[PDB]
Amino acid sequence: ATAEKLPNIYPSTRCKLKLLKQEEEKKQLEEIRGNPLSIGTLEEIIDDDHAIVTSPTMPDYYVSILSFVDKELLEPGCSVLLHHKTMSIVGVLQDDADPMVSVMKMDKSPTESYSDIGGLESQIQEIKESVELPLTHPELYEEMGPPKGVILYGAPGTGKTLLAKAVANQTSATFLRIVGSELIQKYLGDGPRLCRQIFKVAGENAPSIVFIDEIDAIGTKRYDSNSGGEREIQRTMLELLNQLDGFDDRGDVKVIMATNKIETLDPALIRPGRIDRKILFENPDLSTKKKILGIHTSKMNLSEDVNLETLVTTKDDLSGADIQAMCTEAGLLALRERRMQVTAEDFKQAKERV
Amino acid sequence: QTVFLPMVGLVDPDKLKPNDLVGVNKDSYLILDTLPSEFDSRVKAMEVDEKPTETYSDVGGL
Amino acid sequence: PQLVQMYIGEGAKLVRDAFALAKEKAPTIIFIDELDAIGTKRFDSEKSGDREVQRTMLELLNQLDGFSSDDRVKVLAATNRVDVLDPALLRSGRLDRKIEFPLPSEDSRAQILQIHSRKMTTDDDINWQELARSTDEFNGAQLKAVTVEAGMIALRNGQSSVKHEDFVEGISEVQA
Amino acid sequence: FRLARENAPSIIFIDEVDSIATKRFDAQTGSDREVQRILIELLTQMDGFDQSTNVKVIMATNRADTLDPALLRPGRLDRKIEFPSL
Amino acid sequence: REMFAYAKEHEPCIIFMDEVDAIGGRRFSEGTSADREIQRTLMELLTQMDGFDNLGQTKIIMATNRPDTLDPALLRPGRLDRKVEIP
Amino acid sequence: DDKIVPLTEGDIQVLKSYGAAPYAAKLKQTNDLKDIEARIKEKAGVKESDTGLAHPLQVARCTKIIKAKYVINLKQIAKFVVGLGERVSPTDIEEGMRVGVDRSKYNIELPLPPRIDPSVTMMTVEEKPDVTYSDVGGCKDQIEKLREVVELPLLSPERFATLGIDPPKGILLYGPPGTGKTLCARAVANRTDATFIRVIGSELVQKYVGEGARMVRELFEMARTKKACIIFFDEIDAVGGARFDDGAGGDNEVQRTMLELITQLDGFDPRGNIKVMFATNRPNTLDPALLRPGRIDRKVEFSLPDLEGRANIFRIHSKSMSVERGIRWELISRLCPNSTGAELRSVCTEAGMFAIRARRKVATEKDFLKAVDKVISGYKK
Amino acid sequence: LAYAVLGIALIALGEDIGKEMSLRHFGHLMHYGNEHIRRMVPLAMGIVSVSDPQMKVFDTLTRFSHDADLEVSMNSIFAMGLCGAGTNNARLAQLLRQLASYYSREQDALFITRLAQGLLHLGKGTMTMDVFNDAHVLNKVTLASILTTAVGLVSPSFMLKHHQLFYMLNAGIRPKFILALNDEGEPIKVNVRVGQPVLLNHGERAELETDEYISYTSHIEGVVILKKNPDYREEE
Amino acid sequence: NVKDLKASQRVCLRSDSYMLHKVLENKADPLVSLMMVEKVPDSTYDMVGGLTKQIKEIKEVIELPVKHPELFESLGIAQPKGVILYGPPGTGKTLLARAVAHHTDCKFIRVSGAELVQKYIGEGSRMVRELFVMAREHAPSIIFMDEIDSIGSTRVEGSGGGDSEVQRTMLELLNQLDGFETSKNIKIIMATNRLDILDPALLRPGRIDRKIEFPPPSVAARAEILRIHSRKMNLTRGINLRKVAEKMNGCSGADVKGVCTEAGMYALRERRIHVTQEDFELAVGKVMNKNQET
């Protein structure tokens, strides 16, 4: 019943919304603008209430806004309403788009939740406390403050990758995942711009979760700045460091570091007092493995021949992925068996393969 | 844009020669003036301090 | 750096630009700082890597090649040290004279510090040679730096005049 | 190219096409934008046009790495020949 | 070609190309700096040389201060029949 | 359901009120004139361009007046210079509303600057930084000289002239980068309210050539515009330092970009007003031409004093945190070796979670001891 | 529009967790060049400030202190005392250290700062106002205490009368409060999970706590009275 | 509408009114830079036939995931989002990929690997998303990286810092395909006969899940592939293909084609749309010349 009343309520809202007298006045304000008008890009600004512009055809005319909307709403080098006469700024014009930055996984409150990934919790506190904790922002207030970022280690797809979005999901900020090998280019200086573009986003879309994976390459100080040593290595990293060592947060924009090559990196690349956090994924001990086991093992359908301990003890200290991985091809064997309920044998097989 | 013209009034065949600055009616493509080569770019960022006064007493020993 | 451009041979154009209008203002001394900027052709057929800095040199060389007798055109190129050599880089009508600028001797520094100490208010606790001796191979301004620092020092000393100790303290301000 | 089809049978040869071989790989501003199109054109025209061959694309190469498989696409540049032989 | 053709009409003409490593030479990674401009230009001669265009009465002097700085294909006969040393 | 729908019922009617309301004064006011005035006003201004079909400006098209056109085109259509003789126009050369030289200068002024710059400053400058005393905690010895290098000459230029001198015209900062380092620059920048140019050498080398050269000029240009300004470089190591990588041959411009920076900063730039400041990890990397006096005079570490400095720094930091007043920062400071006025937050800042793990308001000694341990062990770097 | 400029001023009060627009809109409202806004929004922020005030404009008030007006400053000192009265730092961060860095450029500033820094430390710097409370019902006692102060509390400001206007908010003014009470229920030892600050005895300070222990009806943030597990049972 | 509208849209604009006169067919759209997309290419797997154990494995790792993923969801796994093939090189190995990809009805992509990490900064990089971008658009879409896989028709033998950087550039993308996406039957085929050149983290599940590996062939496979390519070209009986494939050795499926071509090339030079066996028997050598040549 009330659904009807709810629907028309939604409807009446649409009406008033569309109802934006003022309409004429608004149209009067449109009837001002005339039409059709001309796109054109900003360049600089003065209080002049005249400013000149930028065009692909490149007329650049010194022009006023039609003033109700604002100059300060916009930045130099931005497309603006222009007439076709003088290309008069008609007002605030987006120039919305900018849907690109260098190489990233563009995602927010991502799929991975710490529940999902198999129990890693011992280090989840690390990532939770350093980030998720100030993400609540409540206690961190009294805490007086929160580190910048963390450093993952161990294996991706179990420790490194799975954890990565866990708190990223949990805090529900903008999770930005990248690889340094997803930077460069071998050329000099946009590696920074890559970061910049990223940091543009990072600065822009805050809160966000910065992620970084496998700095094997852009991060190695070597011993030398010369004799074949590619500047861009440091040249990038330093700038990445500049925005890194130029920012830590109280719980807004959070960083993640995922890689196995550790001291390839500068100490201030960590800059303790800022990055306090090393996550390192290990082979989960039989219990902790069992912790992840029961998760992925059970979520895999199977026949009661299967047992965790049947799998648990038989193991070499696998990765928490190999859990998944054994579990993975395990059913694949049952698929090669063309069955929907997996035996215990496939598991041992699938593991002793993988 | 290339136009022919009977050589215009304000110019001299010696003034005339390829690669030159010339006043030309833009519309008519009628050459008005010969122009000296002057604002042929000084890449004005090119910094000419004209013969500034500095001694050899400025930095000795040399 | 201006001769260093995105446009292809922009520099050469610039160089030509630099050449010509200067040839009007000639007699002209064209000063060039750190020629090695444009002073490396590399070794190779990869030279388009920087064709600019090269050809601009080459263009310049050709300009230096274009004339001999014009003293109207004077060409002055400084580097810390040159990289590549050319008998263009040493030539009558091209760069002729390879001119050393050795970091001065001490009395020479005492000579230069003089000029720097010159405009300074001083009580003449000064002895230059001392300073000059204590100093090593300062291109003028390090003396001037000492001169500079000694002054700030001398103010920190309250002294309107600057004294030897002040300069000693400019030196004392780590010269390495 | 069409004129050759207008003149069919005919020949299309290109001296050392590599001048146009690699397009803008990046935002290359001037003169690299057309080497896109010109190539893309030729690509379009190789890659897009009939096999009833009255005219054969022929291109010299000293250095082929500037090129791309879009030329080396089958049906288009089928037959490589190499100037050398001990 | 104006350099060719004018000379080709105005032949005999001597063509002297200064120290040609910016518009000559094998370039770098042979990537595109606008190098694609050079290669063309590099080739434009090649086209006039390895191409049927001859030196009718107009001749071409190539200039370099270092020879090894040039396209190997440029050095080739059909383009260059003389590599002029100046010891 | 039902009772909630009562709230939902209230929701609908409430919204209808504004809907009913909004229509009311809507009838009253009946918006041409905010603009159509200004529009038609500036339509004159528009037309003030539109005759003859016409702060970076880039290009003035002030177009096609032949008697006369009085404009520069720096652009591939009809490049123009008004000069050759005495050539002006009383207020304004001509039109576009654009009146002026584009950027590229032809004669002078002419119509007051139409100018200046494309790409804004792609470099960007925060004046009066958010740091005045911010990281200034524990940073004294440095700033002690910085103030001399920067603050006092900005304060009382006369003294140095009264002496007959200038401040140190350029200065080095090294150690952990920007850590308070840049901010410390930003500090005295905002301490003195001088114009603080944060330009990273990262900005300097880009896809093209004359890159920072272009910048460094515009830098040095708007240096003098912003005069009494701090040109500040973190990552002198970005462009690199002294090197022979010109022997490789590709680096040359990057090298020159320094030499650019090198060249121009040397001769004409007032560094008593326009401040030049450098931040690196490695002072060992310098191109000595940088280390030259009258280019770089003062040279300073960031730095990492003693037990004592840290305490205050700690004491400085922890004031953010709720902290146990019994335990001594001296106690904590004793334990740790010397480390960064950034890292010393790991002392404090980490303990907050300790304080939250220990669920204290006020972190205990061990809370920091552990942190000291935890962090410093957690380094292993 | 004159006191339509007051339009969203009363809206600050309301206000509920939103409040959402206030802290976000307040920054826009206050910036409106009309002083009647620039007067009132700083005032209006107060219950917002203890229920949802601005986080950025806190500094901006410092900027606009002398911008077009010294009464803005006279407010910007006073207002920061207001919003910073007993609500201190955290959400309110950018406001109060400026009062801690507000002392005197003027004996009236000093007057207002002494006012403000008094207000700053009003309630030993720990207070909060939410007229509604977690008993799931709003309070119109204090609601009456407020627009009273709008036409009033004008001793510096427009609608000006006199100085005694300052306290009319006290009809609801509460501390930063967690009231944590025992199973018998006049003040006695009892405790919670951690605050900042410890296990909170009968009425000991914090704000908006979700704790271990259970209230009696509808466990909540805020005031919670404490019963404990019969096995583990305690006054706490 | 405004809503019927789209960007880039080909439209009649009222010329001097500069308003839409009407809308035209928008034209669009793949791209280049060596990330370009051929969209659901065609081949049929029988044509390299005899490999089918692999094909079946392939079908099992791709087609059955593609054709009915939920069978594996019914099983409750994460089915392969990328695939490997490892063994004898150069049968027209692309066919292995395309034919399945064809069969799958998935855009089958080719990309030059090292063009994702270059000198010039960010363009090798920006391509990465756009690659990933269009990938999901026309999904289900199979991706294949050129210049990486060692299966031997597309083999460049990878690169150490070059395409390790690229495959990692793929790997996070792969991990991105393991991301909030979880969009599957988008399969990057990394089908290759040498892994060591690559980060085995590529072997980690979610990237290469079901790890399957190719295997060299022989006369029979050749004879089949021969009888497949010889099939194509116009012929004449008296012709035992095996004998040719017997004469064939150290030969591959792609190499077989060249044999056929030469047989025709012979026959064409013989002025024949009618090919004998003898011709093939020569091409064997002529190709096995080349096979033995460089």
Residue F101 vs residues A291, C7, D66: alpha-carbon distances, Å: 73, 21, 43
- Do the Cβ atoms of H110 and H156 come closer than 8 Å? no
Residues of chain H contacting A155 with CB distance shorter than 8 Å: 201, 204
Q: Do A77 and F119 touch (CB under 8 A)?
A: yes
What does the buried/exposed string (b/e) look like for A191-230 if buried means 16 or more CB atoms within 10 Å of the residue's CB?
A: bbbbbbbbbebbeeeebbbbbbbbbbbbbbbeeebbeeeb
Binding residue ranges of F for ATP: 175-182
The burial of G4, by beta-carbon neighbours within 10 Å (0-12 exposed, 13-18 middle, 19 or more buried), is given as exposed
Q: How far is Cα C154 from Cα C147, in angstroms, rounded to an integer?
A: 10
Neighbours of D (≥3 Cβ pairs closer than 8 A)? E, H
The alpha-carbon gap from A73 to the nearest alpha carbon of chain G, in Å, equals 13
Is A143 an 8 Å CB contact of chain F?
Answer: yes
Compute how many other C-beta atoms are within 10 angstroms of the C-beta atom of residue G118: 14
3-state DSSP call for residue F377?
Answer: helix
Q: Do the Cβ atoms of H169 and A182 come within 8 Å? A: yes
Contact A320, A284 (CB under 8 A): yes
Closest by Cα among G169, G143, G133 to G10 = G143
Q: Which residues of E touch D (CB under 8 A)?
A: 30-32, 34, 36-37, 39-40, 43, 46-47, 50-51, 73
- Residue A250 to chain H, least CA–CA distance (Å): 26
Distance from CA of E9 to the nearest CA of C (A): 27
Closest CA to E17 of E39, E51, E45: E45
Q: Which helix (H) or strand (E) holds G214?
A: none
**Rounded distance, CA G133 to CA G174, Å?**
11
Q: Which residue has the tokens 């470099």?
A: F123
Residue F380 falls in which region: left (phi positive, over 0), alpha (psi -120 to 50) or beta: left
Which residues in D lie closer than 8 A to residue H115 (C-beta atoms)?
25
Collapse the DSSP code of H63 into the 3-class scheme (helix H, G, I; strand E, B; otherwise coil) and give the result. helix
F217/B45 Cβ within 8 A: yes
What string of DSSP letters covers A209-243? EE--B--SSTT---S-SSTT--HHHHHHHHHHHHH
A35 token code pair: 């039409």
Question: Do residues A279 and A150 lie in contact, with contact meaning Cβ atoms separated by under 8 Å?
Answer: yes
**Cα angle F258-F260-F266, degrees, rounded to a multiple of 5:** 100
Start-to-end C-alpha separation, chain A: 58
Other CB atoms within a 10 A radius of the CB of residue F228 amount to: 16
Residue ranges for the known binding site of A for ATP are 154-161
Let me know how long chain A is.
Answer: 354
CB A130 within 8 A of CB A275: no
- G: neighbours with 3+ CB pairs under 8 Å? A, F
Q: Choose from C45, C46, C56, C89 for mutation: most chain E CBs within 10 A.
A: C45
SS3 label, residue C54 = helix
Which residue positions of A form the known binding site?
Answer: 154-161
CB atoms near residue G25 (< 10 Å): 17
Question: Residue C26: which residues within 8 A CB-CB, separation 6 or more?
Answer: C70, C72, C73
Which partners does chain A have (≥3 C-beta pairs < 8 Å)?
F, G, H
H261–chain D Cβ distance below 8 A for any pair: no
Angle at C13 between CA C59 and CA C1, to 5 degrees: 85
Pairing of strands A79-82, A38-42: antiparallel
In F, which residues are within 8 Å of C142 by CB distance?
Answer: 292-293
Alpha-carbon span F149 to F171, nearest angstrom: 7
Q: Give the separation between CA G228 and CA H3, rounded to whole angstroms.
A: 61
Q: What SS3 class is residue A90?
A: strand
Cβ–Cβ < 8 Å for H208, H202: yes
Alpha helix (H) ranges present in chain D?
Answer: 2-6, 32-48, 69-72
Give CA–CA dist A284/A351, Å, rounded.
15
Burial of residue G229 (CB within 10 Å: 0-12, 13-18, 19+) is: exposed
Are H171 and A287 spatial neighbours (Cβ–Cβ below 8 Å)? no
Q: Do F359 and G194 make contact, defined as CB atoms within 8 angstroms?
A: yes
CA-closest candidate to residue G224, choices D86, G233, G195:
G195
Query: In this complex, do C112 and B46 lie within 8 Å of one another by their Cβ atoms?
Result: no
Chain H environment of D70 (Cβ under 8 Å): 32, 36
Judge contact between F41 and A38, C-beta under 8 A. Answer: no
**DSSP at F293:** T
List the determination method: cryo-EM
Q: What's the rounded Cα separation, in Å, for the pair G111 and G44?
A: 22
The count of residues in chain D is 86
Distance (Å, whole) CA C88 – CA C60: 10
**Looking at beta carbons, which residues of chain B come within 8 Å of C112?**
59-61
Find, in chain C, the residue whose alpha carbon is nearest to that of B58. C115
Q: Evaluate the CA torsion angle F314, F318, F319, F325 in order and state its sign.
A: negative
Neighbours, chain B (3 or more CB pairs < 8 A): C, F
Pairing, β A105-108 against β A79-82: unpaired
Kind of pairing, strands F195-200 and F229-234? Answer: parallel
- The sign of the torsion formed by the CA atoms of A264, A268, A272, A277 equals negative
Chain C touched by E70 (CB under 8 Å): yes
How far does CA A218 lie from the centroid of its chain? 19
Question: Closest-CA residue in chain A for H77?
Answer: A328
Closest Cα to residue H88, out of H190, H229, H193? H193
- Long-range residue pairs from H273-279, CB within 8 A, at least 24 positions apart, any chain: H273/H234, H274/H234, H274/H235, H274/H236, H275/H230, H275/H233, H275/H234, H275/H235, H275/H236, H275/H239, H276/H236, H276/H238, H276/H239, H277/H238, H277/H239, H277/H240, H277/H241, H277/H243, H277/H244
Interface test with chain C among F119, F156, F165, by most C beta carbons within 10 Å = F165
CA distances from H120 to A127, A215, F314, G193, H248 (A): 35, 19, 45, 57, 46
Number of H helices, E strands in chain B: 0, 2
F375–A272 C-beta distance less than 8 A: yes
**Length of chain E, please?**
87
Sequence-ordered alpha helix ranges (H) in chain B: none
**Structure tokens, A12:** 């009446």
CA atoms within 13 A on the CB side of E45: 26
With CB atoms and an 8 Å threshold, state whether A271 touches F340.
yes
C-alpha span between G207 and G178 (Å, rounded): 6
Gap between the Cα atoms of E18 and E38, Å rounded: 15
* Set of chain A residues whose Cβ sits within 8 Å of the Cβ of H204: 155-157, 321, 325
The sign one gets for the Cα dihedral G214, G219, G221, G227 is negative
The span from the CA of F307 to the CA of F311, in Å, is 7
CB-hemisphere CA count at 13 Å for H140? 20
A21 CB within 8 Å of a chain F CB: yes
What are residue D31's phi and psi, to 5 degrees?
65, -15
Dihedral (CA of H286, H287, H290, H291) sign: negative
Residue among E30, E34, E73 minimizing CB distance to D31: E34
Closest of H132, H118, H211, H218 to residue H171, by C-alpha: H132
Smallest CA–CA separation between H157 and chain D, in Å?
Answer: 16
Largest CA distance in chain C: 64
Task: Give CA separation, A331 vs A307, A312, A327, A334, A335, in Å.
Answer: 15, 18, 7, 5, 6
Candidates F113, F80, H15, F45; CA nearest to F54 is F45
Tokens representing F233 are: 């470089």
Cis peptide before C27 (omega within 30 of 0): yes
Q: Render F9-45 in DSSP notation, one character per residue.
A: HHHHHHHHHHHHTHHHHHHHH---TTTHHHHHHHHHH
CA-CA distance, F207 to F230, in Å (whole number)?
27
DSSP state of H201: G
Nearest CA in chain B to C10: B43
Instruction: Please indicate if the annotation marks H65 as binding a ligand.
Output: no
Closest to H115 (Cα-Cα) out of H156, H76, H87: H156
In this complex, is the C-beta atom of C55 within 8 Å of any C-beta atom belonging to chain E?
A: yes
Closest CA to H246 of H269, H277, H215, H270: H277
Question: Helices F343-357 & F365-379, crossing angle to 10 degrees?
Answer: 120
Asked if A142's CB is within 8 angstroms of G208's CB, the reply is no
Nearest CA in chain E to D13: E51
A83 exposure class (CB count in 10 Å sphere: 0-12, 13-18, 19+): buried
- Residues on chain A touching H161 (C-beta within 8 angstroms): 217
For residue G218 the two structure tokens come to: 């509808």
Assess contact for F49 and A61: CB atoms under 8 A.
yes
Quote the distance between the C-alpha of residue G115 and its chain's center: 16
Tokens of H225: 């592939």
CB atoms within 10 A of CB A341: 14
- Find chain E residues with C-beta within 8 A of C12's C-beta: 22
Could you tell me if H116 and H224 are in contact, meaning their C-beta atoms sit under 8 angstroms apart?
A: no
Beta bridge partners of D10: D55
Q: Chain D residues contacting E, CB < 8 Å?
A: 15-16, 18-20, 22, 24-25, 28, 30-32, 35, 62-63, 65-66
Q: Which of F93, F196, F213 is nearest to F154 (CA)?
A: F196
Cβ atoms of F217 and F119 within 8 Å: the answer is no
H92 among annotated binding-site residues: yes
How many contacts, defined by CB atoms under 8 Å, are there between A and F? 297
How many angstroms separate the CA atoms of G153 and C78, rounded? 74
Query: Helices (DSSP H) in G33-166: which residue ranges?
Result: 35-49, 57-64, 70-83, 93-100, 107-120, 140-143, 147-151
Structure tokens, F57: 């400006």
What distances in angstroms separate CA G1 from CA F18, F21, G12, G36, G43, one per listed residue? 17, 15, 18, 11, 19
E12: burial class by Cβ within 10 Å (0-12, 13-18, 19+)? exposed
H52 has binding-site annotation: no
Choose from C4, C14, C136, C167 for mutation: most chain F CBs within 10 A.
C4
Structure tokens at G201: 């005895």
Q: Do the Cβ atoms of F180 and F215 come closer than 8 Å?
A: no
Q: Where are the alpha helices (DSSP H) in chain F?
A: 4-20, 22-29, 36-50, 140-146, 152-155, 157-163, 181-192, 211-225, 252-267, 288-291, 307-318, 329-335, 343-357, 365-379
CB contact under 8 A, G198 and F362: no
Query: Distance between CA A199 and CA E37 in Å, rounded?
Result: 36
Contacts of F373 (CB under 8 A, 6+ apart): none
| Exposed/middle/buried for residue G17 (C-beta within 10 Å: 0-12, 13-18, 19+) | exposed
Give C61→chain E minimum CA distance, Å. Answer: 10
**Residue of H155, H126, A103, H41 lying closest to H163 (CA atoms):** H155
Q: What is the DSSP letter of C104?
A: P
> Is H22 known as a binding-site position?
no
Q: Dihedrals φ, ψ of H247, to 5°?
A: -50, -35
* C-alpha–C-alpha distance, residues A93 and A71, integer Å: 10
Q: How many alpha carbons fall within 13 Å on the CB side of residue A163?
A: 34
The rounded radius of gyration (Å) of the Cα atoms in chain C is 22
Q: Distances from the Cα of C91 to the Cαs of C84, C94, C96, C98, H97, in angstroms?
A: 14, 5, 4, 10, 66
N- to C-terminal Cα separation, chain D: 35
Whole-number Å distance between alpha carbons of H153 and H146: 10
How far is residue C88's CA from residue C96's CA, in Å, rounded to a whole number?
8
Q: C150, C149, C144, C145: which is closest to C165 by C-alpha?
A: C150
How far is G214 from G230, CA to CA, in rounded Å? 13
Q: Which residues pair with A302 in a beta bridge?
A: A342
Q: Which residues lie below 8 Å from residue B54, measured CB to CB, with a gap of 6+?
A: none
What does DSSP assign to residue F149?
I
Please report, for residues A51, A59, A91, C15, D80, the alpha-carbon distance to residue A38 in angstroms, rounded to integers and kept in the order given: 15, 11, 11, 41, 52
* Token representation of residue G153: 């509390």
H and C: touch, per 3+ CB pairs < 8 A? no
Which residues of F fall within a CB distance of 8 Å from B27? 64, 66
CA dist C67 to B42, C53, C72, Å? 21, 21, 11
Residues in a beta bridge with F289: none
Q: Which of residues 214-243 of A touch F (CB under 8 A)?
A: 225-226, 228, 231, 234-235, 238-239, 241-242
**Tokens read off for F330:** 């001296």
Question: 10 Å Cβ neighbour count for A9?
Answer: 20
Query: G188 in contact with A at a CB cutoff of 8 Å?
Result: no
Q: Which amino acid is at E30?
A: E
